[PDB]
Amino acid sequence: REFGHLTRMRHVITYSLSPFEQRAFPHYFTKGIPNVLRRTRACILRVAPPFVVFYLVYTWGTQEFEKSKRK
Amino acid sequence: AGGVEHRQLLDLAQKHFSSLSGTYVEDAVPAFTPCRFTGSEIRHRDDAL
DSSP, rough: OOOGGGGOOOOEEEEOOGGGGSSSSSSSSSSSHHHHHHHHHHHHHHHHHHHHHHHHHHHHHHHHHTTTOOO | OOOOOHHHHHHHHHSSSSSSSSOOOGGOOOOOOOOOOOOOOEEETTTTT
């Protein structure tokens, strides 16, 4: 597995620019904010509802250990 | 170049090349706008060559 022996490819062209020809920060807080609002809207409904179930079990669990004592 | 004489070449130029107008139409002058260099790269991938 070295570079000129990996795959076979035809008819694709690549254009690139030098690092000294470029700006470091073209857009940082004018695309950085709406792009993470797209990536957050895609993940939230898969990741958050299991942790809302740990919260409702922690809150009920540490409320039947207090009232077991002192009537 | 070759076997030619300059005096004869000048006379043939006056006879055949003097109907060209010598001052520009509405006398607008050319001026070369310069051309910049950019470090960069282009890659054409074709494995059947």
